[PDB]
Design a protein around this ligand. Structure first.
Ligand SMILES: CCCCCCCCCCCCCCCCCC(=O)OC[C@H](COP(=O)([O-])OCC(O)COP(=O)([O-])OC[C@@H](COC(=O)CCCCCCCCCCCCCCCCC)OC(=O)CCCCCCCCCCCCCCCCC)OC(=O)CCCCCCCCCCCCCCCCC
Ligand SMILES: CCCCCCCCCCCCCCCCCC(=O)OC[C@H](COP(=O)([O-])OCC(O)COP(=O)([O-])OC[C@@H](COC(=O)CCCCCCCCCCCCCCCCC)OC(=O)CCCCCCCCCCCCCCCCC)OC(=O)CCCCCCCCCCCCCCCCC
Ligand SMILES: CCCCCCCCCCCCCCCCCC(=O)OC[C@H](COP(=O)([O-])OCC[N+](C)(C)C)OC(=O)CCCCCCCCCCCCCCCCC
Ligand SMILES: CCCCCCCCCCCCCCCCCC(=O)OC[C@H](COP(=O)([O-])OCC[N+](C)(C)C)OC(=O)CCCCCCCCCCCCCCCCC
Ligand SMILES: CCCCCCCCCCCCCCCCCC(=O)OC[C@H](COP(=O)([O-])OCC[N+](C)(C)C)OC(=O)CCCCCCCCCCCCCCCCC
Ligand SMILES: CCCCCCCCCCCCCCCCCC(=O)OC[C@H](COP(=O)([O-])OCC[N+](C)(C)C)OC(=O)CCCCCCCCCCCCCCCCC
Ligand SMILES: COC1=C(OC)C(=O)C(C/C=C(\C)CC/C=C(\C)CC/C=C(\C)CC/C=C(/C)CC/C=C(/C)CC/C=C(\C)CC/C=C(\C)CCC=C(C)C)=C(C)C1=O
Ligand SMILES: CCCCCCCCCCCCCCCCCC(=O)OC[C@H](COP(=O)(O)OCCN)OC(=O)CCCCCCCCCCCCCCCCC
Ligand SMILES: CCCCCCCCCCCCCCCCCC(=O)OC[C@H](COP(=O)(O)OCCN)OC(=O)CCCCCCCCCCCCCCCCC
Ligand SMILES: CCCCCCCCCCCCCCCC(=O)OC[C@H](COP(=O)(O)O)OC(=O)CCCCCCCCCCCCCCC
Lengths: 50, 104, 63, 172, 52, 110, 62, 20, 49, 251, 101, 153, 98, 88
């Protein structure tokens, strides 16, 4: 059951993730087999375009 | 151009009522047609009718620059034949008129 | 495979000897084929109504 | 001259495809459960777990399906007896003999398979320990039977629709 | 495909021009049935290039 | 055909030009817009969008659809009133819009 | 009913992640957006100081 | 016109975004 | 002179041009999805322009 | 003899059978009246091409059988082998049959234009209905749970014409008034199907864990053929033919 | 050259025959229209080939002159029938032109 | 992309002339079986999502041009050569070789062209793991990567 | 566990029709056997025809005789079962509709 | 063999072609069940086979049909009930 205050910002909350474990978010996104190639193409295009 | 039908005859009685409401050269008929499209499937519901009216406010806001409170402070919401869509209030009033004319 | 083997056997038997009594089943099949050919000729050269009347009369005579 | 020639008809008198509510109404509780399970296993195996599917398929092949196939093959061989049917030392009439075999043998196969099913399917359904145990385990209901019947008819329709095109079908 | 639809074919020729070029017109169909294929197929490739 | 076309041009473009020639005290804009409507909304340069697929390919049609909506966004435009709607899918094949009217913005077709 | 369409009105975020808190907040009947959709595209009239004061005094519904 | 282009390549689909 | 050369010369040329010259494509580009398309030959040089 | 006389002289024999036979057969099979109508229409459309092709082939043979004799000029095989002529006639009949089947069953993709939809210039309606059915058809691979069966039994007597007045009796319903009202609203008034409840889904998953381990997906919602078949084409947003309709679809 | 982004739109060579650039949507439509304009001439071109061939082979006095006994023409609607082809040309021009406009 | 298409075609030609080893042949067989089952011998329109239906057809259409049409041309060319031989031998027109030899040529040339361009057809089906076709595509890719002890996109 | 219960009236009507049909089929098997035997006897003694043709004719005569005997119960049970199936299908669809 | 693979559910396998062209000429005979005479012939043959099995049931391992059981009678009587060739 919800804590009756779900979505409430905790007092003094700071938008930091210095010591967060990112391994829990792996199943929330899907990357294609050519992610590495896309990464280089994205860098190449941005450098030569912007 | 921005309505839901390729010609005004495809539109039902609401388009015909829009033509009757305004003069033949008055381009507020198109805004009335937009009100008809917004009111399709909503006029026969108490919450739907309010939703269609809110759709008119957004439609007027996106067409013309407007401030917060102008549409709420409109004095008369009635429309005459020679009312043209030169201001958000006229567009909003025309859009509301089409929603009222819409039957289904 | 079966068709090839049986065709070869039939050809060999026919070319070797032919004055041998054959099986009743095969003889009846050949009789039926010949009668079917004759009946096809009759139907081609006769009317369906006439065929029906003749068959009805023959059946009545048989009864 | 009509559908009975160019439409699928081999699934309408086998594998319990003819089981409907009329049998279930007169059937007792245990017999109703057995009939529903048999129909579901034959027509919509997806409702069964893989182990149950394999076991039921093996039992069906052993008892009814493969047995009927074997009997139909035997009847087809009986038809093939005497081949070539008409021939002589001059001509062999290969095309005529092939046509006669094509017309006669599959008819005998179908007759034998239908006879095997009509004879053994009721006995298999009534007096099969595996079918009884699995029916008791699953305990299907009338709602399940109706859903299975609709799904089986939809499956037959889908098979016919997919088989509609078999020579040329680019897709667009 | 032209004069055949008319039951007064002499009128068909007289009423159009009073000239007779039917022989060449009806012979041209055979050549015209295949002279366009290379153009049509290349156009399909060209249309796809525009679509891409 | 030319004579009929010329007569239509005269009816729309020549005679109405003389109706108003001086400033008008009452409803000047309404009276000026009355005579302008018949000339600016002729079907010669309005009709065609209903059959836009004759020249616009599916992907071209989608790009032109958003171009047209932006171009004819001004509410005070009798020509846009008489123009066929841009809120429709290519009759052959649509690649961007799945349902007509299911947008994320009342003006942008996407 | 068949011809009913939203026409790009109130096209707010539609969360897809199962554990996103938006998927529950928007499902809550008593959820108030920061600004109404029609007003989200209209020019602001209040002065900067007034806007800051209103936001400071703003209280979450829960 | 009606079929002046004589062909339409409806097969060519909208390019699918492949960004990570 | 009249029919077969004029109705096939351009298409032959365009097909060969694509075969050996990549329809005149300028290489050294990135992400063909975003790059513009170099169209094959479309202006009939055999037909008087 | 009385029953034989009945069979011979039944007025139903003289009466011409209609197309309701398919609908009745489908209803007996289990399809609803509307689902039965849609499936019957689909089958009729599928078989009409074959029937028309057979009729056309028969008519063509009955008319131009003399062409087979005429072609003996170039193919004396027909003249000197009647079996060849019979094979040629059968081939012609099959060719007409295939032409009809292609016309009425082949995809024959066409535009979704109200100006020509339904004219048979393209097999759009049949193609779209077949594609939707095949794509979205997935047999229910579950066993209806006890809660689902109980809800189906309790649904007896419900009618959308007038909502039932639910009255809370603590001695037979238990729980509290508010909780019972919320549960009843979820079960009946809300229109939510039994399989959409979280506990029902959890029980389904627990029961079918073996299939989940084997890698088979469990379909919570049973297939609804009425939600994918529409002979009118409105479900798939196919614009009705202009001249036979007085309304327009947005698309 | 705005950076590595080559913004040049025209790369026509010394003996260019086509449009200078094909990036513009207007020129693409014109290029596609012109290509298909030439396509719809198969029957006409073949017809003129045969009449040219016939006249050059048999209509000379040497081969097969014909006694033209016709006094006056009698055409009444050949002009209307012939004008279908230019009519289609006008329709194609109007349709393509208007869509661009 | 015409430059890419030419490069891919030339790469396949060089590889075919080079030959294949045990590992490459095994990987090719897996790709060829996957493509035939999911693309060539399946109605692409029966998939769920529009994206996979469109891209699956693009792969199917590409296969038809690069294998079926090419094989028919090569098969016909062989049949025509035999037809010319028989015509000269018999000093008349013979029609039997056209069907029979054309079918034999198509059966001979289809496997070689399929082997030549098996990788291209397999790669074009990488719609994404979110779809059934892409998921099966990824599964075969992992198996091929394991067999070849390399990584491919 | 509770389960859908069919209409008692339909169940009783089906029971009667089923009993009648079972009895009629049991009698009709022997009726057809006797008809086949009689037709074979007549063909072999009075009709000059092929043995295979005579056997086929006798089998068809026996089948026709059995069908004539058993048609009434077959048709009655068929119609009763069809009506029961339609009623049950409609009731179940109404219950499960969502 | 591996019947597990065949049993396993697959989207492509389920939606693929199961009946090919060659099967139609070899299986069109099953449509003869529409005819009452054919149904009667099949019923007679099945009853004769059942009688033979019952007579030979004296040997161990063979069991004939028992009229007491409802299922056997129901199946044997409703095999051809409601047959319709026009509905798939
Ligand atoms: C200068 C140098 C440089 C040049 C530069 C390039 C050029 C620039 C030029 C620019 C200027 C352009 C000017 C253009 C205008 C020019 C006009 C001019 O000078 O000419 C005047 C010239 C004057 O007329 P004409 O051409 O002399 O008139 C004669 C007709 O044209 C002739 O036609 P006809 O019909 O009278 O005669 C033929 C007739 C001959 O036949 C008969 O008459 C016989 C009766 C018919 C029946 C026959 C069959 C019977 C069979 C019996 C059974 C057999 C045994 C069984 C075997 C089978 C079964 C076993 O054939 C038929 O009618 C039957 C044909 C049937 C085929 C169609 C059926 C299709 C479906 C079949 C399917 C089969 C496959 C199934 C597959 C299924 C699955 C895929 O043309 C005009 O009239 C002006 C036309 C202007 C344009 C409008 C066009 C439409 C109007 C009609 C005319 C169309 C044709 C002619 C067009 C002109 C070009 C060819
Ligand atoms: C040696 C050989 C070796 C060979 C080796 C190689 C072997 C190779 C392998 C071969 C394997 C082959 C295996 C398969 C072979 C067997 C297949 C099979 O089952 O076939 C037998 C198949 C068995 O049928 P069934 O399933 O037992 O019949 C159902 C029972 O009738 C059940 O029906 P129901 O009783 O519930 O209702 C009908 C009622 C009778 O109630 C009626 O009145 C029915 C009326 C229906 C509508 C009539 C409309 C007529 C107007 C024109 C059409 C209008 C459009 C609508 C048409 C709707 C369809 C009828 O019938 C009765 O109760 C009659 C008493 C029964 C005992 C008498 C039996 C007589 C024959 C059965 C047909 C009788 C039809 C009579 C029609 C009316 C005459 C007054 O028999 C037939 O096909 C029927 C008999 C044959 C008719 C031949 C017609 C030839 C053309 C005549 C043209 C000229 C006249 C046209 C006008 C009509 C006359 C006025
Ligand atoms: C005897 C047969 C009689 C047939 C009946 C029709 C012919 C009647 C006699 C000739 C006059 C025809 C006038 C038609 C148009 C009238 C209205 C009008 O101009 O506005 C609509 C349209 C103008 O539309 P618009 O753009 O002004 O649209 C107005 C509406 N808003 C503002 C919302 C856009 O007219 C035209 O477009 C005229 C173009 C010029 C050419 C017209 C040719 C018409 C077709 C040929 C007819 C030939 C008849 C020959 C008869 C004798 C020989 C047989
Ligand atoms: C009554 C008179 C009516 C006159 C009508 C007006 C006619 C106008 C057109 C006249 C054309 C004359 C023929 C031109 C042939 C050009 C061939 C050519 O270069 O290929 C073009 C085309 C161009 O191919 P391409 O691949 O080079 O493409 C052009 C270049 N790129 C690639 C950059 C686009 O090639 C072909 O057609 C290839 C096959 C040619 C086969 C035939 C060769 C014939 C050679 C000349 C004739 C034989 C020599 C002796 C002649 C003696 C005469 C007495
Ligand atoms: C070896 C010595 C030979 C001596 C020579 C004479 C031999 C005579 C042999 C007679 C054999 C009779 C066998 C009957 C078998 C019945 C089978 C059966 O179930 O049938 C039920 C059917 C009736 O079916 P039903 O559907 O009405 O009812 C079924 C029965 N219940 C309801 C109880 C379940 O009876 C028939 O129709 C049988 C006859 C069929 C047609 C052939 C008739 C031939 C004789 C015609 C004589 C006409 C005389 C003139 C009449 C003038 C009238 C104005
Ligand atoms: C009352 C006014 C008419 C009704 C409203 C329509 C008017 C606007 C459109 C008319 C022109 C359409 C042209 C389309 C492009 C094709 C051009 C073309 O092929 O021209 C070269 C052709 C001849 O050139 P060709 O010889 O190259 O032809 C092509 C040859 N093959 C296919 C071998 C490559 O000229 C014509 O005769 C074309 C006539 C138009 C096309 C008709 C096809 C049959 C369809 C039914 C027509 C019924 C009449 C009404 C029109 C149909 C819609 C209602
Ligand atoms: C489908 O097919 C078709 C087409 O597609 C290919 C078409 O495009 C077309 C459209 C085509 C047309 C409308 C026609 C286009 C034009 C055509 C065919 C003709 C073009 C001809 C040329 C380009 C040739 C160039 C012309 C010339 C005159 C060259 C002459 C050459 C030479 C070597 C002569 C040089 C001599 C001199 C300069 C003079 C020297 C001598 C003297 C001064 C005098 C000497 C005197 C003494 C005494 C010594 C058609 C019809 C078609 O059917
Ligand atoms: C009035 C009485 C007749 C009424 C019905 C008339 C039907 C006309 C159509 C052809 C009928 C052929 C004989 C009966 C076949 C019955 C089974 C059948 O039709 O199966 C279907 C199949 C063709 O179906 P198709 O549309 O291609 O596939 C779609 C599948 N979804 O079928 C076939 O492919 C079979 C036919 C293939 C083509 C054969 C051409 C030559 C003729 C061969 C006849 C058989 C040999 C006979 C030899 C001995 C007798 C002479
Ligand atoms: C099944 C496997 C076993 C082997 C069989 C294979 C069957 C293959 C598929 C069907 C083949 C059909 C052709 C059969 C042989 C040729 C029949 C024939 O002669 O047909 C032409 C005939 C014209 O008659 P004609 O003698 O020329 O009369 C001249 C009048 N001036 O006209 C006719 O008589 C009409 C022929 C119609 C053919 C069938 C057309 C399809 C629809 C049939 C509907 C039912 C017709 C019932 C007719 C009953 C007649 C008693
Ligand atoms: C030296 C000693 C050698 C002894 C050899 C003995 C061989 C015995 C087996 C023979 C072949 C049996 C095949 C069984 C196929 C089968 O049932 O395969 C299984 C399938 C199952 O399909 P169904 O589920 O519809 O029954 O059967 C069919 O599809 C039936 C098709 C028709 C079969 C007719 C058989 C007739 C007799 C043989 C001739 C066939 C002609 C075919 C067309 C030209």
């Amino acid at each position: 059951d919800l804590p009756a205050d779900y979505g409430k910002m905790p007092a003094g909350y700071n938008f930091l993730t210095r010591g967060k474990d990112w391994r829990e978010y792996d199943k929330d996104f899907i990357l294609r087999t050519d992610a590495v190639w896309e990464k280089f193409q994205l860098e190449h295009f941005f450098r030569n375009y912007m | 151009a921005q309505t839901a039908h390729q010609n005004r005859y495809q539109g039902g009685l609401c388009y015909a009522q829009c033509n009757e409401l305004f003069s033949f050269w008055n381009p507020s008929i198109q805004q009335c047609w937009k009100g008809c499209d917004f009111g399709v499937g909503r006029v026969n519901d108490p919450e739907g009718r309010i939703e269609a009216q809110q759709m008119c406010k957004r439609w007027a806001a996106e067409l013309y620059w407007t401030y917060k409170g102008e549409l709420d402070t409109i004095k008369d919401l009635r429309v005459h034949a020679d009312m043209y869509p030169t201001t958000p209030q006229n567009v909003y009033r025309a859009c509301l008129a089409g929603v009222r004319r819409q039957k289904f | 495979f079966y068709s090839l083997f049986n065709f070869y056997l039939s050809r060999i038997k026919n070319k070797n000897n032919y004055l041998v009594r054959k099986h009743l089943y095969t003889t009846e099949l050949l009789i039926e084929l010949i009668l079917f050919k004759y009946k096809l000729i009759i139907l081609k050269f006769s009317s369906i109504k006439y065929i029906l009347n003749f068959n009805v009369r023959k059946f009545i005579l048989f009864n | 001259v009509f559908e009975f020639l160019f439409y699928n008809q081999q699934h309408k008198t086998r594998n319990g495809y003819f089981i409907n509510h009329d049998n279930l109404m007169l059937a007792s509780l245990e017999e109703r459960k057995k009939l529903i399970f048999y129909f579901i296993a034959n027509q919509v195996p997806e409702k069964l777990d893989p182990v149950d599917r394999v076991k039921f398929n093996e039992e069906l092949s052993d008892n009814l399906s493969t047995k009927a196939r074997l009997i139909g093959s035997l009847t087809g061989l009986i038809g093939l007896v005497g081949f070539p049917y008409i021939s002589t030392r001059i001509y062999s009439r290969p095309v005529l003999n092939i046509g006669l075999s094509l017309l006669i043998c599959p008819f005998l196969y179908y007759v034998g398979n239908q006879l095997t099913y009509s004879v053994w399917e009721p006995k298999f359904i009534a007096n099969n320990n595996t079918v009884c145990e699995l029916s008791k385990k699953y305990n299907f209901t009338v709602f399940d039977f109706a859903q299975a019947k609709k799904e089986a008819h939809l499956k037959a329709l889908r098979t016919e629709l997919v088989s509609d095109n078999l020579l040329y079908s680019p897709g667009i | 495909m032209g004069s055949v639809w008319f039951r007064n074919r002499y009128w068909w020729y007289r009423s159009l021009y009073d000239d007779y070029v039917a022989r060449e017109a009806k012979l041209a169909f055979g050549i015209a049935a295949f002279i366009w294929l290379p153009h049509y197929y290349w156009g399909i490739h060209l249309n796809r290039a525009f679509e891409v | 055909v030319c004579g009929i076309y010329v007569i239509h041009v005269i009816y729309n473009y020549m005679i109405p030009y003389y109706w108003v020639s001086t400033p008008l005290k009452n409803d000047e804009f309404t009276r000026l817009r009355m005579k302008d409507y018949i000339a600016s909304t002729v079907l010669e340069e309005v009709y065609g969008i209903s059959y836009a697929e004759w020249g616009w390919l599916p992907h071209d049609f989608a790009y032109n659809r958003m171009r047209g909506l932006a171009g004819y966004m001004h509410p005070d435009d009798p020509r846009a009133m008489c123009t066929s709607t841009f809120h429709r899918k290519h009759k052959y094949i649509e690649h961007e819009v799945e349902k007509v009217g299911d947008y994320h913005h009342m003006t942008y077709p996407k | 009913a068949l011809n009913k369409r939203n026409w790009g009105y109130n096209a707010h975020y539609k969360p897809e992640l199962e554990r996103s808190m938006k998927k529950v907040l928007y499902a809550d009947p008593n959820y108030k957006f920061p600004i109404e959709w029609p007003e989200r595209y209209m020019a602001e009239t209040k002065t900067l100081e007034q806007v800051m004061d209103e936001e400071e005094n703003w209280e979450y519904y829960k | 016109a009606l079929f002046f282009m004589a062909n339409t390549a409806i097969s060519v689909p909208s390019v699918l975004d492949t960004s990570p | 002179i009249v029919l077969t050369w004029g109705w096939s010369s351009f298409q032959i040329g365009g097909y060969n041009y694509e075969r050996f010259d990549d329809n005149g494509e300028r290489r050294n580009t990135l992400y063909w999805k975003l790059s513009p398309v170099e169209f094959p030959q479309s202006k009939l040089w055999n037909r008087p322009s | 003899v009385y029953h034989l006389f009945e069979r011979i002289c039944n007025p139903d024999n003289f009466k011409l059978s209609g197309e309701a036979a398919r609908v009745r057969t489908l209803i007996a099979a289990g399809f609803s009246k509307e689902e039965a109508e849609q499936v019957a229409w689909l089958q009729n459309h599928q078989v009409n091409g074959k029937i028309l092709g057979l009729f056309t082939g028969g008519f063509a043979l009955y008319c131009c059988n003399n062409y087979f004799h005429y072609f003996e000029r170039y193919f004396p095989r027909l003249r000197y082998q009647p079996f060849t002529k019979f094979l040629a006639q059968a081939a012609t009949v099959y060719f007409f049959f295939k032409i009809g089947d292609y016309y009425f069953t082949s995809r024959r993709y066409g535009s979704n234009d109200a100006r020509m939809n339904g004219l048979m210039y393209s097999n759009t309606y049949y193609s779209t209905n077949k594609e939707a059915l095949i794509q979205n058809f997935e047999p229910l691979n579950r066993k209806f749970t006890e809660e689902e069966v109980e809800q189906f039994l309790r649904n007896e007597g419900r009618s959308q014409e007038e909502k039932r007045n639910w009255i809370y009796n603590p001695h037979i319903h238990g729980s509290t008034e508010g909780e019972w009202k919320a549960d009843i609203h979820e079960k009946f008034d809300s229109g939510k199907a039994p399989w959409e409840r979280e506990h029902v889904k959890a029980k389904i998953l627990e029961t079918n864990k073996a299939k989940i381990d084997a890698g088979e997906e469990i379909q919570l919602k049973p297939f609804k053929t009425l939600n994918h078949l529409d002979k009118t084409g409105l479900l798939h947003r196919l614009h009705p033919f202009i001249w036979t309709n007085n309304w327009t679809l947005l698309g | 050259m705005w950076g590595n982004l080559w913004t040049e739109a025209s790369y026509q060579l010394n003996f260019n025959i086509g449009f200078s650039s094909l990036r513009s949507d207007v020129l693409i439509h014109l290029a596609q229209w012109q290509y298909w304009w030439w396509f719809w001439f198969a029957l006409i071109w073949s017809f003129y080939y045969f009449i040219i061939l016939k006249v050059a082979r048999f209509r000379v006095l040497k081969m097969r002159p014909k006694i033209s006994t016709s006094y006056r023409p009698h055409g009444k609607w050949g002009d209307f029938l012939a004008c279908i082809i230019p009519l289609i040309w006008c329709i194609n021009i109007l349709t393509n032109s208007n869509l661009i406009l | 992309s015409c430059t890419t298409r030419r490069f891919i075609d030339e790469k396949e030609k060089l590889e075919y002339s080079r030959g294949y080893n045990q590992q490459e042949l095994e990987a090719s067989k897996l790709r060829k079986d996957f493509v035939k089952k999911y693309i060539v011998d399946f109605d692409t329109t029966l998939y769920k999502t529009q994206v996979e239906r469109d891209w699956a057809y693009i792969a199917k259409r590409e296969y038809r041009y690069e294998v079926q049409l090419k094989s028919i041309g090569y098969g016909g060319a062989l049949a025509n050569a035999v037809l010319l031989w028989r015509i000269y031998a018999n000093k008349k027109m013979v029609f039997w070789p056209i069907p029979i030899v054309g079918a034999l040529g198509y059966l001979y040339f289809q496997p070689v062209f399929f082997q030549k361009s098996n990788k291209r057809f397999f790669d074009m089906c990488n719609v994404g793991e979110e779809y059934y076709l892409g998921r099966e595509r990824n599964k075969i890719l992992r198996e091929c990567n394991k067999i070849l002890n390399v990584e491919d996109f | 566990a509770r389960d859908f219960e069919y209409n008692n009236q339909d169940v009783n009507q089906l029971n009667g029709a089923f009993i009648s049909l079972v009895e009629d089929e049991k009698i009709g098997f022997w009726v057809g056997v006797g008809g086949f035997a009689y037709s074979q006897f007549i063909m072999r003694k009075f009709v000059k025809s092929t043995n295979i043709f005579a056997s086929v004719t006798s089998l068809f005569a026996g089948a026709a005789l059995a069908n004539l005997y058993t048609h009434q119960s077959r048709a009655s049970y068929a119609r009763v079962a069809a009506r029961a199936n339609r009623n049950a299908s409609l009731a179940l669809n109404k219950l499960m509709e969502y | 063999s591996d019947p597990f693979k065949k049993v396993e559910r697959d989207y492509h396998n389920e939606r693929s072609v199961h009946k090919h062209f060659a099967s139609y000429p070899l299986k069109f005979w099953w449509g003869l069940n529409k005819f009452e005479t054919i149904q009667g012939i099949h019923s007679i043959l099945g009853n004769a086979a059942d009688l033979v099995v019952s007579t030979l049931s004296f040997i161990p391992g063979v069991q004939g049909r028992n009229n007491a059981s409802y299922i056997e009678n129901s199946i044997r009587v409703t095999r051809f009930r409601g047959f319709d060739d026009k509905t798939q």
